[PDB]
Amino acid sequence: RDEMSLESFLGRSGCIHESKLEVTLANYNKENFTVWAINLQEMAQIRRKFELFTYTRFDSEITLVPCISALSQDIGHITMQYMYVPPGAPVPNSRDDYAWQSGTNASVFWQHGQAYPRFSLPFLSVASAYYMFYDGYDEQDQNYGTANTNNMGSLCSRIVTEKHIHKVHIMTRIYHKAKHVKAWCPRPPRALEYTRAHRTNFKIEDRSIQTAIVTRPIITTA
Amino acid sequence: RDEMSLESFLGRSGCIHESKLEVTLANYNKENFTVWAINLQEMAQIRRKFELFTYTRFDSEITLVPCISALSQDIGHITMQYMYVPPGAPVPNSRDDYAWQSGTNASVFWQHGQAYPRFSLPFLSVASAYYMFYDGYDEQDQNYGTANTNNMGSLCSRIVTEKHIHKVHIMTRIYHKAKHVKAWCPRPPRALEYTRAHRTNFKIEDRSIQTAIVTRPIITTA
Amino acid sequence: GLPVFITPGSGQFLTTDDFQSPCALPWYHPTKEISIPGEVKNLVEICQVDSLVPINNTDTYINSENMYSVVLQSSINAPDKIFSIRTDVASQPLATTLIGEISSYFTHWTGSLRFSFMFCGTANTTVKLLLAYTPPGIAEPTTRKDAMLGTHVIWDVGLQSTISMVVPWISASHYRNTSPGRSTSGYITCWYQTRLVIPPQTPPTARLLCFVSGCKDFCLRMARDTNLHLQSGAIAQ
Amino acid sequence: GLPVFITPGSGQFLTTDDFQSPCALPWYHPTKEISIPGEVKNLVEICQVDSLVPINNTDTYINSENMYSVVLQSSINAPDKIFSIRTDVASQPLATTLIGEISSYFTHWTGSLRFSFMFCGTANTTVKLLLAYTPPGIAEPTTRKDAMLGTHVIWDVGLQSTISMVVPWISASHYRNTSPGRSTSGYITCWYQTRLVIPPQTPPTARLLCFVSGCKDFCLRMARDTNLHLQSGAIAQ
Amino acid sequence: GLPVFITPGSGQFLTTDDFQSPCALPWYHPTKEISIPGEVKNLVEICQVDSLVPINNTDT
Amino acid sequence: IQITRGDSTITSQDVANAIVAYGVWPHYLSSKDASAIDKPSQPDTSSNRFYTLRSVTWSSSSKGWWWKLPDALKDMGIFGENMFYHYLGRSGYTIHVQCNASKFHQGTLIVALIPEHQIASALHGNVNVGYNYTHPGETGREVKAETRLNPDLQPTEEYWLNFDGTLLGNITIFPHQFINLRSNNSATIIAPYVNAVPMDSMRSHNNWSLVIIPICPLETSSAINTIPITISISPMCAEFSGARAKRQ
């Protein structure tokens, strides 16, 4: 009556990307960061929910879960920076360039002693709706799958400590939740498995035409 | 007048299962998790309370108490995942399958620095009442004790850290409390001791017919 | 502005607590309530049910049907003594009754008990039996002379069910310890006054019912663990 | 003064939660809403859409257009049996339909289904076919004699679309398990009563449509993961 | 939204303090009050009582 | 005197005396606590009638007996084949079980009604009650200390252990009635449908179970010492949903 809605169907905390940061024994410069761009179509458990609609309109909620593990000399008492860059803006890849020390980007800090990282995000799409499937091409001729209109931003974690560094694993898992869920125009579900982002492939890896449909021998006995 | 109720009789924090997780020195894959399924009839101190009723209707409250002990290289600065899976749904047994990274399952995280893990749960039974005793059989012929209708879910704890691991004891004790207590149809108490789950045995382990009833010699002196 | 201070005592581990915390999955709609009897809000309804007393719980009658029934004989030669039991619910054999084991889950208890004993034999047998109560002050006097002394009613076997008399709660305070008191509370005693009168060619052996039930006024405060059942052996996972 | 105490249960990790936390960038003004159809607030509109049933999902017809259509023959020699399918939405071949795969994302389900089957061949063919429903109590009886026994309506090929009959939800409780039940719920059966009557020089081979749609009353509670698709191979970053 | 800030001075150890913290077992009903004399709310009643003075508290 | 409801009636009804079962009338289920319709075809209106069962032998040293409902009636009456092919249903009961009594001999019996069973069957390994023992029929379980079906799934036959795992005498927690001789010669207890599910199976699941435990056995020194028991059960609120073939 009330629970049967798109608010409950898409409103679940699910892991989207496995961001794993490993500390190198020796580095010339601060170049220890995970390279990852924004995406909604990643895993089969979450993508099939987006494959069921043409255009969606909902705000995003991002929960960061970083894992701390000690290895040598009780290493773990450190504070890390998690900065978000607005969509469209150019993103550098260094210690302190133009973006990492600016008052235009959203910045948050976490240290062990307080609660787990949890914050809300506003509207991300440039148009009225979020692009799930971009039919044809935009202003370019060849590119299909990822469009300039479907932009959300970028998430990168950066190291702060300079000399006092040792090999520690920082497993920063990102969870996603939906808010203000309003979508239109339902679609039929996907039949086969996914291989690449924004792509539903049939003829790939030379695998047989075996669908998820279970076969029955005589359809009279069952 | 008001305290004499089923709300106070069943409304006490009692330990149900002793979940003990031990870290192996060397493992090929992430296979360190405690195997435990949902149950209400476990210990004699808690079961006799449920043995006094045919059908119950109350929401559950689960409190997790994990113990951290240091052994080598100050190991203890780690964050663990405690995920709950809805009843009826299939549960895998690996690091990251379909359930562990989905937005359909209830997930909670705990690290030392915040308060002790404590959360509430909704209705669990598929019918109007929770099944204490399932008379006869369901759609199957042989199985007695645990039924498909009496399903609550599954609780499993999973490791996050990859390479930085050492032998540490994680004693995650689970406490249970009752909410919205409304039950009907009282029963007489159990006479003997319990051996297995959902079973009250008389002829087992070849023990003598000695009941908890204290014997008096002449019933005239006392 | 915002009051940011950690209050001493709050924000820590506690056994019994009330929380207004948000639910894990509140979107699910539970199954609607249907009319089902046996509904209990108070613990008075369980105590209201008449529980049968095992008056003869000896080692000889423990594995038989005769443990709950009273042994009676028509012959006039044996002493007039039948039984001598306590009034405490947390004592044998009143501990095995429905009201007894529920009282084991409480530290403080108070209330009165209803006593009715009806004939179990044939229709052509009448016997006057005396029911007596004895104060807990001094040791129990067990003689034939102490029959009509202090709360004494003789019941004759007729047609009606046994009407209960005054068996009150005797204490200066409202609450008393639940520990097994063998001399703390009063005693229930019954004596042979007449022997089973039967016509020629009639079975001499007959028995008697033994019932007990809770009264109107019952007030129990703090709960505890039972002292009858213990588990330390093999348990299921 | 200020209540400073950490409440047990609150201030920790939780999967499903509602927050009134401040936004990261609330200064941005979103694009205005325009009139776009297909707007869904409930999940009843997706179930309202008529989904075609693959009645003949055998290994022979799996890679053809004949899998969704019913095989019919004009000759009067073969047995009168057509098909025997379940009523459960989480079972083959009703699992592949629009309402089936949505039901796979839920643990508890209830509701009725609409059944209409129209002719696919030529205009000059009339054939009376019987639609029957069978209780799940005993094993399915498949004979010609069990045609007019329990919920039986014969449909003749005329001009109108097939009007649906009573296919109700049969259960004591409002909710039942979503697990594939091959004997838990009822069965949908159709039988040949008459053979395809055709004039001289007319194609004997003809087919039949197979539609299913959700009714008015639908109530689904808790959500779950699908059991048809699994991913463990190569994934994109 | 919700004011989340730790106030300096609050959330620490204190000797004399007043708390409105929930009880451990509030379901128990206490024994009713009966008429008993000697009831004191102030410390003036103890001082009101005439105390005898040991005027000759020598070693003898 | 007789209870007027159907064309077929039984004698020796006397005065209906029983303790009230928590203030509950055998309610005819309306369309309030059910689905939309769930009514394909209405059964017999005069189905609410008394059914006489075959009299069982009374032993000198009586241990006790038990009958499961609606397992005891499976081939009795017209409603026998109906509920088997009809998918799931609910039914109330009007119990009238007694024996002939005179003003000479002795014998007292207590009747209880508990719809659950949990008895020991095997040793150490998975224990499970027998399928044939849960469904004996009209004869029931003739409780005698003997070997049945060799050593296998076998619930122990003990009256004081109450089978389910409860203390004797204290079993009177559910609707209970004590029957003597001078006060009462006939037993009548009101029994409605009490279950978590509105409709359940009759082939595997048991709705109720009648408990027959004697406190004073038949001990008489006369010419005859056998008094057979007359069992009369009247089903209430017979409503079933499911259309199926008669012959299979």
Side-chain angles (χ1 to χ4, degrees), chain A residues 2-26 30-72 76-163 165-166 168-222, chain B residues 2-26 30-72 76-163 165-166 168-222, chain C residues 1-75 77-237, chain D residues 1-75 77-237, chain E, chain F residues 1-10 14-37 39-145 148-243 245:
Chain A
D2 294 313
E3 201 170 19
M4 279 187 70
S5 59
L6 283 72
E7 199 78 41
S8 185
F9 183 77
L10 291 159
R12 274 195 166 187
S13 59
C15 186
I16 49 159
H17 171 72
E18 296 176 45
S19 183
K20 48 180 180 180
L21 197 145
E22 52 182 317
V23 184
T24 322
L25 296 161
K30 306 285 178 68
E31 209 179 315
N32 292 316
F33 46 86
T34 53
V35 183
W36 182 73
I38 47 94
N39 199 7
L40 285 155
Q41 293 176 313
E42 299 186 64
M43 291 290 180
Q45 281 77 37
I46 50 156
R47 187 177 174 172
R48 203 182 179 187
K49 296 180 180 180
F50 300 114
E51 288 282 321
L52 212 79
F53 305 100
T54 55
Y55 303 100
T56 52
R57 187 188 169 95
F58 65 95
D59 293 47
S60 299
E61 192 181 316
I62 296 299
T63 311
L64 288 89
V65 186
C67 298
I68 309 159
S69 299
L71 192 74
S72 185
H77 300 93
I78 44 162
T79 313
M80 286 289 183
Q81 188 184 320
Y82 304 97
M83 197 182 76
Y84 164 75
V85 187
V91 186
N93 44 24
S94 60
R95 188 191 192 265
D96 286 318
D97 206 52
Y98 290 95
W100 293 102
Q101 54 184 28
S102 185
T104 52
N105 307 306
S107 301
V108 77
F109 306 96
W110 181 80
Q111 55 179 321
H112 42 89
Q114 209 189 329
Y116 296 94
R118 203 168 292 173
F119 73 101
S120 299
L121 282 166
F123 207 87
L124 300 155
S125 185
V126 288
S128 299
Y130 293 89
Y131 297 89
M132 304 288 96
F133 306 97
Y134 201 87
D135 193 22
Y137 315 102
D138 199 42
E139 261 189 63
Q140 284 183 126
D141 192 48
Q142 197 178 322
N143 294 43
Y144 197 97
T146 52
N148 60 317
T149 53
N150 192 43
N151 205 335
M152 291 181 284
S154 291
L155 291 317
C156 292
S157 56
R158 193 180 63 90
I159 194 160
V160 182
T161 47
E162 194 180 317
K163 285 283 179 70
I165 42 96
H166 278 88
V168 282
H169 285 270
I170 313 297
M171 192 72 73
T172 315
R173 285 183 173 267
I174 306 159
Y175 279 87
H176 177 80
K177 204 176 184 290
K179 284 281 282 180
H180 283 87
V181 186
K182 282 181 179 180
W184 55 83
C185 298
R187 290 186 72 86
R190 160 76 170 167
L192 286 165
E193 291 179 44
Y194 314 102
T195 51
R196 291 278 184 177
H198 296 263
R199 295 159 180 180
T200 58
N201 299 326
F202 303 95
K203 198 82 176 70
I204 192 161
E205 210 179 43
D206 295 313
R207 204 172 184 178
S208 184
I209 321 159
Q210 193 73 31
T211 330
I213 309 159
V214 186
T215 52
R216 43 205 288 257
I218 200 78
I219 72 158
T220 51
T221 312
Chain B
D2 294 313
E3 201 170 19
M4 279 187 70
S5 59
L6 283 72
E7 199 78 41
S8 185
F9 183 77
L10 291 159
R12 274 195 166 187
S13 59
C15 186
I16 49 159
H17 171 72
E18 296 176 45
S19 183
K20 48 180 180 180
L21 197 145
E22 52 182 317
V23 184
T24 322
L25 296 161
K30 306 285 178 68
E31 209 179 315
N32 292 316
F33 46 86
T34 53
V35 183
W36 182 73
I38 47 94
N39 199 7
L40 285 155
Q41 293 176 313
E42 299 186 64
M43 291 290 180
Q45 281 77 37
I46 50 156
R47 187 177 174 172
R48 203 182 179 187
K49 296 180 180 180
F50 300 114
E51 288 282 321
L52 212 79
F53 305 100
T54 55
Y55 303 100
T56 52
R57 187 188 169 95
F58 65 95
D59 293 46
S60 299
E61 192 181 316
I62 296 299
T63 311
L64 288 89
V65 186
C67 298
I68 309 159
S69 299
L71 192 74
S72 185
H77 300 93
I78 44 162
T79 313
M80 286 289 183
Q81 188 184 320
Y82 304 97
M83 197 182 76
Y84 164 75
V85 187
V91 186
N93 44 24
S94 60
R95 188 191 192 265
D96 286 318
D97 206 52
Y98 290 95
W100 293 102
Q101 54 184 28
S102 185
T104 52
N105 307 306
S107 301
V108 77
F109 306 96
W110 181 80
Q111 55 179 321
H112 42 89
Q114 209 189 329
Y116 296 94
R118 203 168 292 173
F119 73 101
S120 299
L121 282 166
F123 207 87
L124 300 155
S125 185
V126 288
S128 299
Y130 293 89
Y131 297 89
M132 304 288 96
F133 306 97
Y134 201 87
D135 193 22
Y137 315 102
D138 199 42
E139 261 189 63
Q140 284 183 126
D141 192 48
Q142 197 178 322
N143 294 43
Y144 197 97
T146 52
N148 60 317
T149 53
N150 192 43
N151 205 335
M152 291 181 284
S154 291
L155 291 317
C156 292
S157 56
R158 193 180 63 90
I159 194 160
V160 182
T161 47
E162 194 180 317
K163 285 283 179 70
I165 42 96
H166 278 88
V168 282
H169 285 270
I170 313 297
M171 192 72 73
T172 315
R173 285 183 173 267
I174 306 159
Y175 279 87
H176 177 80
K177 204 176 184 290
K179 284 281 282 180
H180 283 87
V181 186
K182 282 181 179 180
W184 55 83
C185 298
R187 290 186 72 86
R190 160 76 170 167
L192 286 165
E193 291 179 44
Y194 314 102
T195 51
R196 291 278 184 177
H198 296 263
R199 295 159 180 180
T200 58
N201 299 326
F202 303 95
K203 198 81 176 70
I204 192 161
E205 210 179 43
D206 295 313
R207 204 172 184 178
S208 184
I209 321 159
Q210 193 72 31
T211 330
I213 309 159
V214 186
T215 52
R216 43 205 288 257
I218 200 78
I219 72 158
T220 51
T221 312
Chain C
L2 294 160
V4 277
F5 184 79
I6 310 159
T7 314
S10 299
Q12 58 184 36
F13 182 79
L14 194 70
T15 52
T16 52
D17 42 34
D18 187 47
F19 276 91
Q20 292 178 40
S21 59
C23 188
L25 207 150
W27 304 289
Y28 174 77
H29 184 266
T31 321
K32 55 184 178 180
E33 193 184 315
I34 49 160
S35 299
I36 306 161
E39 193 180 316
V40 280
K41 194 180 180 180
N42 297 123
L43 296 159
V44 75
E45 288 184 41
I46 315 161
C47 298
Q48 196 185 235
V49 182
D50 295 47
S51 56
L52 200 67
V53 193
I55 205 81
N56 199 0
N57 57 315
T58 55
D59 298 57
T60 319
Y61 296 94
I62 187 79
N63 290 22
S64 60
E65 67 279 315
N66 302 346
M67 55 182 290
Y68 283 85
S69 61
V70 190
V71 183
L72 308 164
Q73 202 169 129
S74 62
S75 60
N77 61 320
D80 297 13
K81 201 174 187 180
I82 317 172
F83 65 88
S84 184
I85 55 155
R86 300 169 190 91
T87 46
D88 287 315
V89 284
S91 60
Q92 288 287 322
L94 290 167
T96 49
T97 56
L98 291 162
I99 193 160
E101 277 153 306
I102 266 78
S103 298
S104 299
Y105 279 91
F106 283 95
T107 52
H108 302 88
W109 66 277
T110 180
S112 299
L113 291 160
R114 200 179 74 177
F115 291 93
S116 298
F117 313 100
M118 219 280 283
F119 204 70
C120 202
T122 185
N124 291 358
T125 310
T126 174
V127 45
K128 286 183 176 290
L129 292 160
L130 206 156
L131 285 80
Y133 177 79
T134 316
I138 205 79
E140 51 176 45
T142 52
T143 45
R144 288 186 287 266
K145 199 179 180 180
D146 298 322
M148 52 177 286
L149 292 162
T151 56
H152 50 276
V153 172
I154 313 97
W155 187 78
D156 186 44
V157 187
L159 198 146
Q160 64 163 38
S161 298
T162 314
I163 180 159
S164 303
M165 290 298 291
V166 185
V167 189
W169 164 262
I170 308 162
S171 183
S173 59
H174 270 94
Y175 302 98
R176 196 160 282 186
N177 199 16
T178 187
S179 59
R182 58 204 296 176
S183 185
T184 316
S185 190
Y187 311 98
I188 300 297
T189 49
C190 190
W191 295 82
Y192 297 119
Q193 185 62 44
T194 52
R195 280 79 172 183
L196 284 83
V197 179
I198 44 160
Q201 290 290 323
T202 313
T205 52
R207 283 89 188 265
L208 194 80
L209 278 305
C210 200
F211 276 97
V212 76
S213 185
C215 289
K216 292 91 180 180
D217 53 303
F218 269 89
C219 293
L220 287 80
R221 198 157 67 182
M222 201 178 74
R224 62 167 286 182
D225 295 313
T226 181
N227 62 315
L228 283 82
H229 292 77
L230 291 163
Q231 206 75 237
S232 296
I235 207 80
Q237 290 180 36
Chain D
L2 294 160
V4 277
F5 184 79
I6 310 159
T7 314
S10 299
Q12 58 184 36
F13 182 79
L14 194 70
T15 52
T16 52
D17 42 34
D18 187 47
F19 276 91
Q20 292 178 40
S21 59
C23 188
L25 207 150
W27 304 289
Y28 174 77
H29 184 266
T31 321
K32 55 184 178 180
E33 193 184 315
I34 49 160
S35 299
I36 306 161
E39 193 180 316
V40 280
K41 194 180 180 180
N42 297 123
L43 296 159
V44 75
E45 288 184 41
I46 315 161
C47 298
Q48 196 185 235
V49 182
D50 295 47
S51 56
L52 200 67
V53 193
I55 205 81
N56 199 0
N57 57 315
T58 55
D59 298 57
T60 319
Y61 296 94
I62 187 79
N63 290 22
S64 60
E65 67 279 315
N66 302 346
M67 55 182 290
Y68 283 85
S69 61
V70 190
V71 183
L72 308 164
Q73 202 169 129
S74 62
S75 60
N77 61 320
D80 297 13
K81 201 174 187 180
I82 317 172
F83 65 88
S84 184
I85 55 155
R86 300 169 190 91
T87 46
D88 287 315
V89 284
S91 60
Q92 288 287 322
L94 290 167
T96 49
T97 56
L98 291 162
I99 193 160
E101 277 153 306
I102 266 78
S103 298
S104 299
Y105 279 91
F106 283 95
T107 52
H108 302 88
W109 66 277
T110 180
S112 299
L113 291 160
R114 200 179 74 177
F115 291 93
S116 298
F117 313 100
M118 219 280 283
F119 204 70
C120 202
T122 185
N124 291 358
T125 310
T126 174
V127 45
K128 286 183 176 290
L129 292 160
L130 206 156
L131 285 80
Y133 177 79
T134 316
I138 205 79
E140 51 176 45
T142 52
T143 45
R144 288 186 287 266
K145 199 179 180 180
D146 298 322
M148 52 177 286
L149 292 162
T151 56
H152 49 276
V153 172
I154 313 97
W155 187 78
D156 186 44
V157 187
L159 198 146
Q160 64 163 38
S161 298
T162 314
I163 180 159
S164 303
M165 290 298 291
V166 185
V167 189
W169 164 262
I170 308 162
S171 183
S173 59
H174 270 94
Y175 302 98
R176 196 160 282 186
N177 199 16
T178 187
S179 59
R182 58 204 296 176
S183 185
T184 316
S185 190
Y187 311 98
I188 300 297
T189 49
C190 190
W191 295 82
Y192 297 119
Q193 185 62 44
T194 52
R195 280 79 172 183
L196 284 83
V197 179
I198 44 160
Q201 290 290 323
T202 313
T205 52
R207 283 89 188 265
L208 194 80
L209 278 305
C210 200
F211 276 97
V212 76
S213 185
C215 289
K216 292 91 180 180
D217 53 303
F218 269 89
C219 293
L220 287 80
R221 198 157 67 182
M222 201 178 74
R224 62 167 286 182
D225 295 313
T226 181
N227 62 315
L228 283 82
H229 292 77
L230 291 163
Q231 206 75 237
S232 296
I235 207 80
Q237 291 180 36
Chain E
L2 294 160
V4 277
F5 184 79
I6 310 159
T7 314
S10 299
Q12 58 184 36
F13 182 79
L14 194 70
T15 52
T16 52
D17 42 34
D18 187 47
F19 276 91
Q20 292 178 40
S21 59
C23 188
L25 207 150
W27 304 289
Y28 174 77
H29 184 266
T31 321
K32 55 184 178 180
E33 193 184 315
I34 49 160
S35 299
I36 306 161
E39 193 180 316
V40 280
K41 194 180 180 180
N42 297 123
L43 296 159
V44 75
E45 288 184 41
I46 315 161
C47 298
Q48 196 185 235
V49 182
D50 295 47
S51 56
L52 200 67
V53 193
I55 205 81
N56 199 0
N57 57 315
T58 55
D59 298 57
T60 319
Chain F
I1 49 163
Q2 57 187 45
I3 306 298
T4 172
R5 197 164 190 88
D7 60 308
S8 59
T9 181
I10 51 159
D14 208 47
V15 184
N17 59 309
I19 191 79
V20 191
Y22 305 97
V24 179
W25 180 274
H27 66 95
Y28 289 88
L29 191 72
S30 59
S31 60
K32 192 181 79 69
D33 296 315
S35 61
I37 308 159
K39 287 176 79 180
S41 59
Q42 287 186 322
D44 296 313
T45 319
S46 60
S47 59
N48 300 322
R49 57 195 290 180
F50 306 98
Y51 293 94
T52 315
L53 201 78
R54 192 182 176 91
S55 299
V56 286
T57 52
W58 197 292
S59 59
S60 59
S61 58
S62 299
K63 297 281 181 180
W65 289 273
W66 57 273
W67 277 271
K68 281 180 170 287
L69 293 160
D71 170 56
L73 306 165
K74 57 178 181 179
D75 296 313
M76 297 290 180
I78 316 295
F79 72 101
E81 285 188 44
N82 292 38
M83 59 191 167
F84 186 80
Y85 287 92
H86 284 62
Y87 189 48
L88 314 174
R90 57 188 290 174
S91 186
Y93 307 98
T94 312
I95 312 157
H96 188 73
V97 179
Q98 73 285 333
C99 59
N100 292 123
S102 61
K103 301 173 186 290
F104 207 88
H105 49 77
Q106 57 181 38
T108 307
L109 195 144
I110 313 160
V111 178
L113 199 73
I114 290 88
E116 289 294 329
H117 280 86
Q118 194 76 239
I119 333 97
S121 299
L123 293 160
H124 190 80
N126 295 26
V127 289
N128 210 298
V129 76
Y131 186 80
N132 294 42
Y133 293 95
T134 45
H135 301 86
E138 55 171 311
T139 319
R141 182 76 179 92
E142 194 177 44
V143 182
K144 285 180 79 180
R148 270 293 279 274
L149 191 81
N150 271 0
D152 194 66
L153 306 176
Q154 255 272 52
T156 179
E157 301 296 321
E158 292 292 319
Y159 59 94
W160 66 293
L161 287 166
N162 302 358
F163 306 101
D164 66 331
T166 55
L167 295 162
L168 188 69
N170 299 311
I171 199 169
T172 52
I173 191 81
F174 277 91
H176 63 285
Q177 219 288 307
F178 43 90
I179 302 95
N180 205 238
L181 297 164
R182 60 171 79 199
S183 299
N184 295 303
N185 62 316
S186 59
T188 312
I189 306 96
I190 311 159
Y193 181 81
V194 188
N195 208 299
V197 282
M199 286 180 180
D200 212 334
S201 185
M202 282 70 73
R203 201 180 75 92
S204 299
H205 179 268
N206 298 122
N207 297 15
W208 281 99
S209 185
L210 189 69
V211 186
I212 301 95
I213 299 295
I215 191 79
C216 286
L218 186 75
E219 292 177 316
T220 178
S221 299
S222 299
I224 50 160
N225 60 101
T226 47
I227 43 158
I229 330 160
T230 313
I231 297 95
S232 299
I233 313 161
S234 184
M236 290 290 287
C237 311
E239 288 180 43
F240 300 97
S241 184

